[PDB]
């Protein structure tokens, strides 16, 4: 049972729009919308979406394996050794949000301050004392974007496992000698940095040049979660305001995906005429080039929706029914929709290019979609006694200042983490929070395992957060 | 009664080193050390300081007025109009941490997300509806460092008032016409940006070229808080670890200031031989060039302590008794003191160049000195019933979703803010926190009105913070 | 009769290696090597080549038309209008070395100081008075590389004609309105800059992604000049020193092209065993990435000559027989060949990425191959009486300072230029020299219509230039 | 007899404005204007000047020594050793235009291609074979502006000698050890780069902060050449067009200098009322910030000619009688004077910031003032038999290809060079031209030892250059 299974199970249930069942449905955790900063729903005039992993949620682990397999074949096709074809994607290993260190070839899990929580070389997990030889402060400067790459996305999931697979292979293949910053193969030296780049490159290639999008569109039921509730919600959003799409993907892909997502013998409610996905949107924009989209942007173009190709030149006309946009900026959306930032709830999955940047750069309200969260919640409520026991040992160890406690703490931590996978929870490693966690609280006003949980709150709802107080203020 | 008075009153009391009186002294707020992230004092091996507004706390408002007067004379000396000499520094107006907008010439108080809390043009406070003509989202991109300058420091206090003084003068002088981005004087157009730069420049000039440092050193009792408790604390720090200084200031100034700060007929305790300020330090470093200091740094030089001038060339020798350093980097301190980041508690007052950067870039533990805080605390504990009434009206207005409340909220907010000054608290405007507040919590592990509050905790103390939990985790 | 015909006619003649016939052959202009700076051939220890338009000279106009046709189809394939398919490459229009002005959409011919010689909008040649509305000083800042693109190469020939074709089409198509900086198509505005970029992009695409290289290799006799004299010369070069190749092209293409160029039933002389093209080289280097090659370079890789693919990682071994290199730098060639700059005569065709940069950045001796020059010479010696008449009218107009002369000067100039084409000589427009001319003199020590003219000088030859004197020095 | 003596001797003679004596005066070399590119004087509508070393020519070696002495005292004042005070400026050593190599601490004389002509370490002249250990190709990349500083100006003359003085001192002082890239002083290491920077800095300091300008203005007869012919020429320039000034210097200095230069009991001709220097100018501009002046420039300000200080803000009014400008750009001059580039003859002395940049960036016509040239000419016409003998030995050595010649060539070269000084001619080292020479020909249309030689040509004069031909074109 993966996280995408949990979502598709909730996707298969019709929507019960009784005002009481709604209140009762969103009492269970898996249908709640969690609040990091207070949000008056009546002040939202525009609802924004990205597509990939928001409207279209890719079924795990089928889609990650397909991304892995395609990437492995691309590397082999440029001269990586054949053994890579013996690799197989293992969803139990990678947790989203790790930091790969191109200098020493380590996958690292870190907190909001760049403190090392977990270090693994290949599939070898390094313990506290042994990491200090390369990380003498148990600390990394995340700002050093030349050395450290953060695997923020679910697209990064297959490369996350791959980078481990690769380090482990070369470490243990006798044709290579291991060195501190890479592998020596007689007279070729492959640094972890160039090995990293090759992977990064081959992932890019399978999305933009290879067959990933092709093989996806030929089996959408296998790879894409469908939910008849999705047209319902969007329809209701259009009743109280405006709805727009701003995806990085291209209109041909966006047309294929969006058509499938709306492929039902009915419209928003069962029994209504079916409507084309574009009619649920007031403004459609593709090739968004996020995060550059929230700054200067790119040139605003117009799609020829028959040919799928862009019209030549810069588009200077107004927002029309039917028109589809390419490029532009976040200001394009504000100007054409007559909106201000805090009028806009922008629903997305990218913690950086969607959520952080629209908040910092524009003042947009944010809703963060976390696919895995559907499985993350399950593990949490089942294992809450372990975390409660952990909270207990911390408090007791704090009283002790008036030694076997510290070793029991590291043990219940280890056991709790493993329930989430080899790399542990998305949001923490024991009692210590992650960089990812920290970002979700700081930048995502609302968050959930799917934005469909918004169907279950009335449109007048005041999401409430607790006010933050400084130490001296309590 | 200013904040510097509160400190100098606590500075004049001898230290009562009984283990009970200590516990009892640090129960009152004004002597507590507040904790944002847990800190084991036994893990600190090195204590770091800056000087200005940390070891040497400049008496308010005497020092701000001297900085103001000198700056006003410098502007007049390059052809600003004479009326500036009629200005007089008013400590009730400026609050540290404001953002000056060089485009529209407004002083702005903003929160962690760049939300406008207070906007003032000159001395004219703009209300909510009227700000939206220049700030259509009530929002500024703080990242636009070409348009927005944040007045982080107490050195920025006199220019903060000056920029208002200036806008107000030109607005109301009939020789000028007001325009949106500056003032037109017949055929000269002075933009708020160039007016800003001139000020910024004249502040720099009085510190580095003018007579500010001179006039300070000729009346140190008037301008610098002295506390016989300061040698005590440093001595105790040297008993359990190493102590270092890293100031941006120059050795001649640092020698004058530091000598005064240690000018007592005794050493650390009354009755002990007096020691020279340098002997309380394991490593002294001047011309630190923070924040560049925590990155690549500058070249490490050696001071000729007799002449006050630097020796020629790059210093390549080891840490010696007596030697004084110039430039270098934070790695210089680690290497010479044999320390790792989390071994170091670095005590400073600059929220950016001291605290934020040593944490993000190095993994240093941080203690933030907030001078004004001594007065900020006083206003808070006296007016806690106003804030409690505010907290009450927010909760009640939240229940109301089952209109005169919203106008009473803005009224008790206004009254509370004014008690702090015309620009309100350092840390908030009503129930909404500031950018500054947000940074103190995020980057300063410990904070206080003076680092001398550390004298009152034993050296084994485990400062404790509450663990942070995500919404779904409670 | 094009220039490539003149070369292929000389290529078809066997080499007569009698010491007298050599001296007599290189007396005619078409077989001379012209000298801009003195060059002792005995001091050359290494001979360097690029490939495209040096070893492999592409037959005109067949190859330019194929590049044009392919480029036109690529633009149509991204939504340019169909009429482009009615275009046909016209070799009489473009002269290499023009400057396209992306602001006003003009092809421009300019001198060493950026003085306008010829301005054409589409196919409309603007006369002196009319250009001053956009060029008020008859001058362009060639340094403004954002506005001006110099069409240096023979690869740029088809886009040179295309950019004219395009401007002329849109100017005169009624579906568009002409404006100063581009064309308005209802609500799309196509600037000359974006139209330029699209072309630049589609040229890049046909070389690197399209079928140009494919269609070339399937008809090498149609598209590539072959000369049995080429192995002879290279063999003799290897007898007195070392010979190397450094091409931007890829090893698969370089293998196909180079094999054809050496495809003869004999080796260097008729009757000798045939040798494989690689054996004529001491060091082979592909993917050179010139001009970046003469600075920091790229990473040195090693080609797997069986698969055509690069080996993975950085190559750290020595120069071996058989090895082929990828990337690297000019220092790679010096180090492996044990050479200094002035030991190296580097033979190439790119006035910038080959010749200028190897001279300025490294101190290499340079030989510039100018394909067109074979036709340029023919026009010059036939029309020398026109140029002599021009020289005469200038001198006479200079004496006149003690008006129909100035109009006769512009008339004989016009007539002379046209003999070279619609855009005139590569090297001049009348008595005024071009930017290109100026660069050849300043940066190319030797130059010729083909480097094969070097076969006709003994290996001890001291090429001689006249010493340059300053005015006051004569 | 220095070069400034030759000028001041010509400055002391009244102007004989008979049309015959003029023709006869400019037949001698020392009063000719030499032509690098043809120039119709009737097409000049605006005459431009800088001031320092053009209108005001500083008397040698008095002014260089004063610059040296002041600079030496400034270095001593920041802790350089006392022995520097034993240095004394020696005008026989430095030639303008050398390249100092901050890596190996060598003064170098180089040609247009960065070929080493002369290398001196301190005062030790390195011969051909010995330079190849640091310069293996006898070649430097002049583009590497981090390593190489070109001493273009006469202001650079005293530092040129100083850098030698310094290297020689430290090399031979026993308190220091010499190393490849600097000097080790126990535990301080002074690199030639930092030693260079210190000098560069101390030269800047004496001009802008020290007493150089002060001590100049208190003895203008000692330090500044005065010529009553200067008002004459400018007056005649104003009769046929417009005259402007654009100096980097400040208005207070420019007022002091310019007043002295016009201090005569008469105006342009003897017997005319004296006029104030400003009235000879249509547009005066100070703080020009060349070469940035010929690009984007700085903000246009207006000087308060009574106070010497700038008015506050940006000046937006028109060109008025009496107004003085500060900053701006070259476009400011064109717009206010209604001129195009080729309308403007700009007379200056800086080969880069004046001449090269106004030509490349704007299309200005250029006149280059070369102070030293008055002495350079004298040495040349006296020693023409040595150069003729040199030209002879080169030709003979070229015939010899059908060994004591090559050693006689290096000997007559050495003897010829020394007549110019220890570093030889400005324009050559033997038969090989310098980088400086090359630039004068390429960028200065006209040049002379003083622009006063323009008085001797009528205003209709067509300066003539020989047309340049490519090898194949003769």
């Amino acid at each position: 049972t993966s996280w995408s299974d949990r979502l598709q199970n909730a996707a298969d249930m019709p929507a019960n729009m009784d005002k009481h069942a709604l209140k009762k449905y969103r009492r269970e955790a898996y249908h709640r919308v969690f609040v990091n900063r207070s949000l008056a729903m009546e002040k939202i005039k525009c609802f924004g979406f990205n597509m990939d992993y928001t409207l279209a949620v890719y079924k795990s682990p089928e889609y990650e394996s397909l991304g892995f397999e395609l990437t492995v074949e691309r590397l082999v096709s440029i001269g990586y050794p054949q053994e890579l074809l013996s690799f197989a994607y293992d969803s139990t290993f990678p947790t989203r949000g790790l930091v790969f260190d191109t200098l020493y070839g380590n996958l690292l899990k870190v907190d909001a301050y760049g403190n090392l929580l977990v270090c693994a070389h290949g599939f070898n997990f390094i313990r506290g004392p042994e990491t200090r030889e390369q990380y003498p402060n148990k600390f990394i400067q995340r700002d050093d974007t030349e050395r450290f790459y953060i695997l923020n996305t679910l697209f990064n999931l297959p490369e996350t496992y791959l980078l481990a697979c690769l380090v482990d292979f070369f470490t243990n293949c006798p044709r290579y000698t291991s060195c501190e910053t890479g592998f020596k193969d007689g007279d070729l030296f492959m640094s972890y940095r160039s090995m990293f780049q090759d992977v990064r490159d081959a992932v890019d290639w399978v999305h933009y040049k290879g067959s990933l999008k092709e093989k996806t569109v030929e089996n959408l039921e296998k790879y894409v979660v469908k939910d008849g509730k999705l047209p319902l919600l969007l329809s209701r959003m259009k009743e109280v305001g405006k709805v727009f799409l701003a995806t990085n993907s291209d209109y041909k892909y966006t047309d294929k995906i969006m058509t499938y997502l709306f492929d039902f013998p009915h419209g928003p409610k069962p029994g209504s005429s079916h409507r084309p996905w574009q009619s649920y949107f007031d403004l459609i924009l593709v090739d968004a080039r996020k995060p550059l989209f929230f700054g200067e942007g790119t040139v605003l173009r117009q799609v020829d929706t028959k040919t799928g190709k862009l019209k030549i030149g810069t588009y200077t006309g107004p927002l029309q029914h039917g028109i589809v946009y390419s490029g532009g900026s976040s200001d394009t959306i504000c100007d054409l929709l007559g909106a201000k930032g805090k009028d806009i709830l922008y629903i997305g999955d990218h913690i950086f290019g969607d959520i952080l940047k629209s908040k910092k750069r524009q003042g947009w309200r944010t809703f963060l979609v976390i696919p895995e969260f559907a499985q993350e919640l399950h593990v949490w409520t089942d294992k809450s006694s372990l975390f409660e026991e952990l909270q207990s040992l911390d408090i007791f160890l704090a009283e002790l200042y008036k030694s076997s406690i510290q070793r029991r703490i590291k043990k219940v931590t280890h056991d709790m983490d493993m329930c989430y996978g080899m790399m542990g929870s998305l949001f923490r490693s024991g009692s210590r929070q992650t960089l990812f966690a920290s970002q979700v609280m700081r930048y995502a006003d609302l968050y959930a395992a799917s934005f469909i949980n918004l169907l279950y709150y009335p449109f007048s709802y005041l999401f409430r957060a607790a006010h933050v107080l400084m130490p001296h203020e309590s």
Side-chain angles (χ1 to χ4, degrees), chain A residues 106-286:
Chain A
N106 295 332
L107 270 187
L108 312 161
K109 194 202 210 164
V110 301
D111 72 8
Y113 298 104
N115 282 331
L116 254 54
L117 304 166
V118 174
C119 172
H121 189 78
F123 307 106
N124 184 33
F125 284 79
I126 321 297
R127 199 47 49 194
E130 183 196 343
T131 72
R132 289 200 189 264
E133 315 165 301
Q134 303 179 310
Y135 308 97
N137 199 26
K138 283 192 177 170
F139 160 78
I140 66 141
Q141 309 174 321
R142 331 149 14 198
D143 28 312
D144 192 354
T145 77
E146 303 289 60
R147 190 178 154 186
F148 301 110
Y149 188 89
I150 296 164
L151 300 130
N152 285 315
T153 81
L154 294 92
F155 289 123
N156 300 139
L157 272 167
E159 63 192 301
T160 313
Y161 181 50
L162 187 49
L163 294 159
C165 284
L166 288 169
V167 178
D168 165 68
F169 169 73
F170 292 113
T171 291
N172 294 111
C173 182
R175 298 192 304 270
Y176 306 91
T177 286
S178 308
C179 320
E180 205 189 359
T181 68
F183 300 101
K184 178 169 199 296
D185 172 32
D187 275 337
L188 313 155
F189 179 82
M190 192 207 314
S191 78
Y192 300 117
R193 179 64 190 86
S194 51
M195 188 189 76
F196 168 76
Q197 198 52 54
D198 278 329
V199 181
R200 192 83 289 291
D201 291 357
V203 175
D204 280 358
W205 181 98
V206 166
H207 277 95
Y208 303 144
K209 296 191 175 175
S211 40
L212 182 49
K213 295 180 154 62
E214 184 195 77
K215 291 185 166 54
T216 307
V217 173
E218 78 194 24
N219 214 341
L220 290 168
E221 298 78 7
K222 174 181 205 175
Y223 292 115
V224 185
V225 180
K226 196 183 197 172
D227 184 0
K229 291 191 289 299
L230 158 55
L232 184 63
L233 186 46
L234 297 189
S235 69
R236 293 173 55 101
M237 286 176 178
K238 225 162 161 306
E239 294 175 16
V240 315
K242 299 180 191 166
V243 192
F244 72 86
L245 175 61
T247 172
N248 281 359
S249 270
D250 60 281
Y251 181 75
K252 270 206 192 64
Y253 191 68
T254 303
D255 204 355
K256 282 168 195 305
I257 297 286
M258 293 301 276
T259 295
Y260 163 85
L261 290 185
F262 285 74
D263 187 25
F264 296 99
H266 62 79
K269 309 185 92 172
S272 56
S273 302
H274 172 276
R275 303 206 275 121
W277 70 265
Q278 294 95 2
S279 66
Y280 292 83
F281 297 92
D282 282 297
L283 179 162
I284 304 164
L285 192 149
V286 299

Side-chain angles (χ1 to χ4, degrees), chain A residues 35-37 112-113 142 351 355-357 359-360 364-366 368 433-447 468:
Chain A
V35 187
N36 275 314
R37 272 162 310 281
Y113 298 104
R142 331 149 14 198
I351 193 56
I355 304 315
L356 179 153
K357 292 240 92 104
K359 178 58 91 175
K360 301 189 77 183
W364 286 15
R365 318 300 316 259
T366 50
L368 175 68
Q433 290 192 294
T434 45
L435 177 49
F436 191 79
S438 178
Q439 298 190 302
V440 179
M441 319 179 70
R442 254 191 64 71
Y443 298 117
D445 304 335
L446 315 166
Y447 72 100
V468 181

